[PDB]
Design an enzyme around this catalytic site. Structure first.
Site: not given
Lengths: 58, 50, 499
Positions: C366-369
């Site tokens: 996840s790049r927001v994660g």
């Protein structure tokens, strides 16, 4: 019932349901077997209790 | 209830094919002629409103 | 009466006014009517044929306007009047679409009567810019322990559900929808994600299953199922996510939250391919239309966590991509992977090895994660990420003379893997996620036998509910684990382990 527009069978099964409404009647059958069982059990229970209490003090 | 709904769909489809029969009756009539006049005068009113 | 409803319908027909632009079909082949007329046509405008078929006008050519039929070719025929509806593709948007299974046109395909809608908005509306957004800061719990901890899901953000064909991809998604019931039940609009499931190319049999499961879990009352079934034609299939997005935009515009699940863009891709190739537009890579990158990018950028000036709202999204032989290499996967911000990669081997959800932790990112992870859940699962990472490395060591350290990793790792199994279509509340993971983190589960892990789990939960549902209520409401709670929780786990 207000869903069905053919209603002349909802009054039928309503009346059949309310007719056979005591679908199965009351049962207490544990009142002769429970008391008899309680007598044998009680007799034995008190005997055991008295025996082991007696032995403890001995 | 299930059969009641099914019967309603069946009635609607019975009346649908009856509507086709009425359409054929209408196209038989010289209402077929007379309504062309009705369309004509209505269009005169429409096109004049443009 | 059947007569009365029909009578109302006939009565509801009456008169008309000038048909602004007629057309006459020149040639109709392949659902590509090429029409002579329609001089003042707007791009992708909706046009109505004699047959009543609707179309869009993707090609506005220098003398013919290439309508694309939304309907079957059978009904359209050459020389047909082509009335100009004069309204670019727009779909009703409003609040009434909740609990309404509608097709792309907005016609209830479940016959739940005329749509109650507050606007009809175009389906080509362009996304909110750089400054009209404010960074993600609101979790969305999916009720899947692994998703919520290993790859936490925020709001307005997008992450793939990219995985192998028919691994019940829809099941992983459907679980999220179910968990939204808990938050939905609450009155706070903060706690209200109005989910939209966008069934693209999905067989009607599948949609029947979808409908029943959603009804069964009472989900319809915050659900919308935009349905473009397999049968539904390539214009509908093309415009189906676009249409869906517009519905989401209305909620987003009201500043509410919602989750729109595009499943699957792979069938969207195929539809664009069909349109372009049939319209003789330049072909491109992997025989997917040249501008397929542009299509996918347009859709996926609509999802946005709005700014506070725009009264912070969201339109969380979860695109689903079906990998063909697990090829992330493939052109349609590569494009989507680039566009999205995170991926969840379900893996067939894991499914076979009975891990369900079959999410492959390694290939999930996840790049927001963790930015939108519950604080409590964040605390109790930093350790979890590292342990699983080690378990992966020490996985191959599972073939004898094994170091005590490696063996320690293996015991802890195997138990964790077993713990993260979940029976699909049962979501698990965060207040019950937090205890289970705490135990695993404190390694008290290491002692518990592998076979007994399943039994342990339910027992621990019931034990916690009996022992202290005060703690649970505190966990739910405070949302931040105090030292006293973490203390009590450790004790509770120890006590539970003892029984």
């Amino acid at each position: 019932r207000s869903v069905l527009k053919n209603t002349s069978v909802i009054d039928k099964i309503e009346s059949y349901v309310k007719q056979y409404k005591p679908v199965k009647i009351d049962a207490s059958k544990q009142l002769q077997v429970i008391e008899s069982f309680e007598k044998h059990a009680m007799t034995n229970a008190k005997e055991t209790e008295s025996l082991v209490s007696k032995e403890l003090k001995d | 209830v299930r059969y009641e709904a099914s019967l309603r769909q069946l009635e609607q489809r019975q009346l649908a094919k009856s509507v086709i029969s009425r359409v054929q009756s209408e196209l038989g009539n010289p209402k077929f002629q007379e309504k062309v006049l009705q369309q004509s005068i209505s269009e005169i009113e429409q096109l004049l409103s443009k | 009466e059947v007569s009365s409803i029909l009578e109302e319908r006939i009565k509801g027909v009456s008169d008309e006014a000038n048909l602004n632009e007629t057309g006459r079909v020149l040639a109709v082949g392949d659902g590509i009517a090429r029409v002579f007329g329609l001089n003042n046509i707007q791009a992708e405008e909706l046009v109505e044929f004699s047959s009543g078929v609707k179309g869009m006008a993707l090609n506005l050519e220098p003398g013919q306007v290439g309508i694309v039929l939304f309907g079957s070719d059978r009904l359209v025929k050459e020389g047909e009047l082509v009335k100009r509806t004069g309204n670019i593709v727009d779909v009703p948007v409003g609040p009434g679409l909740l609990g309404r299974v509608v097709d792309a046109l907005g016609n209830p395909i479940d016959g739940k009567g005329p749509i109650d809608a507050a606007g009809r908005s175009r389906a080509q509306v362009k996304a909110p810019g750089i400054l009209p957004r404010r960074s993600v800061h609101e979790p969305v719990q999916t009720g899947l322990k692994a998703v919520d901890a290993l790859v936490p899901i925020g709001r307005g953000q997008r992450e793939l559900i990219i995985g192998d064909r028919q691994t019940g991809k829809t099941a992983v998604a459907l679980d999220t929808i179910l968990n939204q019931k808990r938050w939905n039940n609450g009155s706070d609009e903060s706690k209200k994600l109005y989910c939209v499931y966008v069934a693209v190319g999905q067989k009607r049999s599948t949609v029947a299953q979808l409908v029943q499961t959603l009804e069964q879990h009472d989900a319809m009352k915050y659900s919308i199922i935009v349905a473009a079934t397999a049968s539904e034609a390539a214009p509908l299939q093309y415009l189906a996510p676009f249409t869906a997005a517009s519905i989401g935009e209305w909620f987003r515009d009201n500043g509410k939250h919602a989750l729109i699940v595009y499943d699957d863009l792979s069938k969207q891709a195929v539809a664009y391919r069909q349109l372009s190739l049939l319209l003789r537009r330049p072909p491109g890579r992997e025989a997917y239309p040249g501008d397929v990158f542009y299509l996918h990018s347009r859709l996926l950028e609509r999802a946005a966590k709005l700014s506070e000036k725009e009264g912070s709202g969201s339109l969380t999204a979860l695109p689903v991509i079906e990998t063909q032989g697990g090829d992330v290499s493939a052109y349609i996967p590569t494009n989507v992977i680039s566009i999205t911000d995170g991926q969840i990669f379900l893996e067939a081997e894991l499914f076979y090895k009975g891990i369900r959800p079959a999410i492959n932790v390694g290939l999930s990112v996840s790049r927001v994660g963790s930015a939108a992870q519950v604080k409590a859940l964040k605390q109790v699962a930093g350790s979890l990420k590292l342990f699983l990472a080690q378990y992966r490395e020490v996985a191959a060591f599972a073939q004898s003379d094994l170091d005590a350290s490696t063996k320690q990793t293996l015991v802890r790792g195997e138990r964790l893997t077993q713990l993260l199994k979940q029976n699909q279509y049962s979501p698990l509340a965060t207040e019950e996620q937090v205890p289970l993971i705490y135990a695993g983190v404190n390694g008290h589960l290491d002692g518990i036998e592998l076979s007994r892990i399943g039994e342990f789990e339910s027992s621990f939960l019931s034990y916690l509910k009996s022992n202290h549902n005060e703690l649970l209520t505190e966990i739910r409401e405070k949302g931040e684990l105090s030292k006293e709670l973490l203390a009590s929780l450790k004790s509770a786990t120890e006590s539970f382990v003892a029984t």
